[PDB]
Copies of this chain bind each other. A is one copy, B any other.
């Protein structure tokens, strides 16, 4: 309730199971995807998220978004189309993503429900050889910093174990 939680972790780290546990007592759930239980309703959406995360949401309806990483990828390919990603203007693309993330953050601030955002840690390997992967890793890292600063709580999930770091 009037709370924003960010859950981050690596691939198959258990971060989705952890986020579901955070909201398991909510009478109802809105799942934003970028077979679910009966008291869940699902929406597929990765842009203009203030149209779903609104001041009219029932205060007892938890909102779970999975996941920020795929939102970023979807925005990049929406802007890039079918063109060769080697040629994308990643500076201009990140400005567009910054607008969408700012809409997301402003919407959470005005919504009475608990919002849980799931994201991925993608930056503790080696520098990618592929240009898109290099820029994606940088953009995802900056996006996660911004969301963590806005969040009231931040969990890092490692091998299924939650570590509360904010």
Contact = CB atoms under 8 A, between A and B. Distances in A.
Counting chain B CB atoms within 10 Å of each CB, the highest count among A122, A125, A146 belongs to: A125
A80 interface: no
B127 A148 contact: no
A138 B10 contact: no
Q: How many copies does the complex hold?
A: 3
Interface stretch (A35-43, A49-57, A58-66, A156-164): A156-164
A10 B121 contact: yes
B156 A158 contact: yes
Nearest to A119: B159
Interface of A: 6, 8-14, 17, 119-130, 133, 136-142, 144-149, 154, 156, 158-161, 163, 165-166
Given A119-B159, A122-B126, A154-B159, 19 more contacts: A6-B159, A10-B124, A11-B124, A11-B137, A12-B123, A12-B137, A12-B141, A13-B141, A14-B145, A17-B145, A121-B158, A122-B124, A122-B125, A123-B125, A124-B124, A126-B128, A149-B160, A156-B159, A163-B165
